[PDB]
């Protein structure tokens, strides 16, 4: 990967095609990118492909199957406690690689394809250098937090809000991903 | 329950580019 | 004179 | 698609502009007080700062704005008029050294271009290259704050 981290988004389907696809569980669409904007019939969020696996937040995907060209695909991993789930990365996607530098300077990629700076304050916390309204981060759960090199340091899970403005973010560090696989 | 459906993508691998005059 | 825009650059590389 | 960086020309020369906070900024040494072309006629500069070599008109059509950097990183990246990205280490407020010096020919026509941080956020606008013997070893730039202040 490289820097500066720049990202863009593309919508691939709408509400009706999404509902149909959700039921049939068969999606014939072409897949590209490291992060997929994903949706159930109740909510929409993100899923990040790290090392051949498409990871996302359990509180979003539950135990559901991901719709694929060959019909539904069951999850490879499920960890209610760590709030993780993973499916084999879709055919066409590009995976990110875990961070191996321990940089405290993280960058969150939102569902709007905006990358916002986050200062790591702990294993699963980092503070937004420029806080934003929580409505801005809605739908970004499952999205990546990269180090200056563009490597996955963790997955966005929850926001730390005060009066509707998020000051910090709660994430799932890649270590939990490794652990969830060994489990 | 239904399946989680991919409704879009976010591409980090893109690099600065002169937008094509099309 | 006047400054004219001869082209554009998209930093993310967004195609199309 | 919408572009953040516009490639402009003045007959005299050609350079770049960068939309930050809805304003299309570029170098005074390129545009001067010139207006920018529009399908409805010439549009005038919203800001002109001969002192800072900074001029800005309202962001044009087919453009999208860059966000100022708020992470402080010293690891900058310059985007040229050819979409080439060049890693630059921040030496100070308006100076940064190329990690791999290049002949000035490579940095030509890029004034006005953005000086991005690791997050693709604007740090400054490439003002002019600082070179030794035809080799651009570093660059001069206008920090975003100057722009945010000019507004
Ligand atoms: C994602 O699941 C979100 C991000 C929203 C900031 N996170 C949560 O919902 C979590 C879930 C919880 C951890 C089980 N909850 C929160 O972040 C709470 C705060 C809790 C903090 C605890 C912390 C200290 C450990 C806040 C108050 C919400 C997510 O994005 N979910 C999908 C979603 O929001 N979908 C929306 C929808 O209706 O489809 C959506 C999507 C796009 C635009 C608007 C709304
Ligand atoms: Zn790293
Ligand atoms: Zn920054």
**The domain that contains A81 carries what CATH number?**
2.40.10.120
Please count the CA atoms within 13 angstroms of the CA of A182 that sit on its side-chain side. Answer: 6
Domain hosting A31: range is 1-96
Method used to obtain the model = X-ray
Same-domain status, A169 and A182: yes
Same-domain status, D52 and D30: yes
Cα A6 to middle of ligand 3, angstroms: 12
Q: Which residues of A are annotated as a binding site?
A: 99, 101, 147
Question: Which residue among the candidates A39, A60, A68, A83 is catalytic per the annotation?
Answer: A83
Query: Which residues, at least 6 apart from D40, have a Cβ–Cβ distance to it below 8 Å?
Result: none
- Bridge partners (DSSP) of residue A119 are A105, A127
Q: How many CB atoms lie within 10 A of CB D135?
A: 15
Distance CA A18, CA D123 (A): 40
Distance CA A166, CA D77 (A): 29
- Element spanning D106, H or E: helix D104-107
Strands (E), chain D: 5-9, 14-20, 23-27, 35-36, 47-49, 54-58, 75-79, 85-92, 95-103, 114-116, 122-132, 135-143
Give the helix ranges, DSSP H, for B1-22.
none
Beta-carbon separation of B10 and A46 below 8 A: yes
Q: For position D111, which CATH number holds? A: 2.40.10.10
Query: Which residues, at least 6 apart from B5, have a Cβ–Cβ distance to it below 8 Å?
Result: A13, A18, A21, A22, A27, A38, A39, A40, A66, A67
Residues in chain A: 183
Distance CA D10, CA D94 (A): 26
Residue that the structure tokens 């695909």 belong to = A73
Q: Which of D69, D48, D66, D67 is nearest to D57 (CA)?
A: D48
Quick check: A155 and A104 in contact, CB under 8 A?
no
Structure tokens at A59: 């509180």
Residues in A closer than 8 angstroms to B2, CB to CB, are 22-23, 25, 40-41, 64
Q: Which of D66, D88, D110 is the last residue of a domain?
A: D66
Q: Which of A96, A113, A142 is the last residue of a domain?
A: A96
**CA D25 to centroid of chain Cα atoms:** 7
Q: Which of D48, D66, D84 is the last residue of a domain?
A: D66
- The count of structural domains within chain A is 2
Same-domain status, D51 and D120: no
SS3 at position A55: strand
Quick check: D113 and D81 in contact, CB under 8 A?
yes
Structure tokens at A66: 């991901």
Q: How far is B8 from chain D (nearest CA, A)?
A: 16
Strand order across the A84-88 sheet: A8-11, B5-11, A35-39, A44-50, A53-57, A84-88, A77-79
Same-domain status, D150 and D137: yes
Same-domain status, D47 and D73: no
Distance CA A157, CA A168 (A): 11
Same-domain status, D83 and D43: no
Residues in chain B: 22
Same-domain status, A117 and A183: yes
The alpha-carbon radius of gyration of chain B (Å, integer) is 15
Same-domain status, D58 and D92: no
């Amino acid at each position: 990967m490289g820097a500066p981290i720049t990202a863009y988004a593309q919508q691939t389907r709408g509400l009706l095609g999404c509902i149909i696809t959700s039921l049939t569980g068969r999606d014939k669409n072409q897949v590209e990118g490291e992060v997929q904007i994903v949706s159930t019939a109740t909510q929409t969020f993100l899923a990040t492909c790290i090392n051949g696996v498409c990871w996302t937040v359990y509180h979003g995907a539950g135990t559901r199957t991901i719709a694929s060209p060959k019909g539904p695909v069951i999850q490879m991993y499920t960890n209610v406690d760590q709030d993780l789930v993973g499916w084999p990365a879709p055919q066409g996607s590009r995976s990110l690689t875990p961070c191996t530098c321990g940089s405290s300077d993280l960058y969150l990629v939102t569902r709007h394809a905006d990358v916002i700076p986050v200062r790591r304050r702990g294993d699963s916390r980092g503070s937004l250098l420029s806080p934003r309204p929580i409505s801005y981060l809605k739908g970004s759960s499952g999205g990546p937090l990269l180090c200056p090199a563009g490597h996955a340091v963790g997955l966005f899970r929850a926001a730390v809000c005060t009066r509707g403005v998020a000051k910090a973010v709660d994430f799932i560090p890649v270590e939990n991903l490794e652990t969830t696989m060994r489990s | 329950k239904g399946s989680v459906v991919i409704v879009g993508r976010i591409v980090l691998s893109g690099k600065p580019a002169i937008i094509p005059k099309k």
